[PDB]
Amino acid sequence: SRLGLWSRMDQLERHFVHQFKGECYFTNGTQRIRLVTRYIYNREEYLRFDSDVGEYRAVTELGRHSAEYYNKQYLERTRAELDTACRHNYEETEVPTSLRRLEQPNVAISLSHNTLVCSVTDFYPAKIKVRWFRNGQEETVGVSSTQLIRNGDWTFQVLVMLEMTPHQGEVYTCHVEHPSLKSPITVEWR
């Protein structure tokens, strides 16, 4: 199953907030894992365990005594989580789900001197490369791009624009490359 990182219990018009964040950083598969837990009061991170540091540390004065407590009680089992949570989730849960999720992008050229819009929508993962071509040649001047837009539903979208000279008999093409494709998508226009 999937595993969660433990929020460790500390010792003993207005609103108050506490936040526990457990963050697993994977680099090159599982060759390098970095575990970071954060304890946040309102918007203030006062206490942090960081696998690279190897123990809990107070971030603010507010966590002065919390660091020592969490080091006596929780140090050993927090370190072990890098393995029983981080590595276990990646290798046993992400690999056969998220890391396999491939959503092919939808490409749609539209018109709005003028402006050609290349809409690239509903793709996953995030890596993608979109280019404009005129006469087999790559356009560079007059290409604007949005930043990669995350939709929140596990797809992304991106919009690439080209200012052009509408000469009749000129053919503009939007070229799209993405890990989901065995061949790049090309879509043409007038």
Add this chain to the structure above:
Amino acid sequence: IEADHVGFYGTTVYQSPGDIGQYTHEFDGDELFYVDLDKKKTVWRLPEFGQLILFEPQGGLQNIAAEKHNLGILTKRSNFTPATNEAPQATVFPKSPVLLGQPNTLICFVDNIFPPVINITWLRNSKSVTDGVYETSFLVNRDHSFHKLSYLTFIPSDDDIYDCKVEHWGL
């Protein structure tokens, strides 16, 4: 921090008054699920999600309890320093290019939310709409404010005017 991938495994937020809790997981920046604290159920983001590999919701419940425990201790320790309300921003955008009589979804991205209590409503032609609406969990930001997305599924007609209105203590 740099990495090829990032798991958020056990993000918990607790809030008083009102005893308001939230437990979620997240991978590469997207929500995997949240645990429903009334039904004690794992609730996935997409219906394809908790089939092959599950998450037992009671572990979410424990993290919620510890965080309620931690909040009390910390509230008192700060001599009762209350949260500063922030001013959230809304930005709408379509999921795919809008065409007439073509099935689409409006997406409201609401950022700089703090504390995580908020109303996000859709208005078609100034009149409130609730048919066809989905709303994500409070999703974490690096600076410990939150963001949140609402989705309004819709039929594009001309003269149809949509807007995403936000109600927050910080406005």
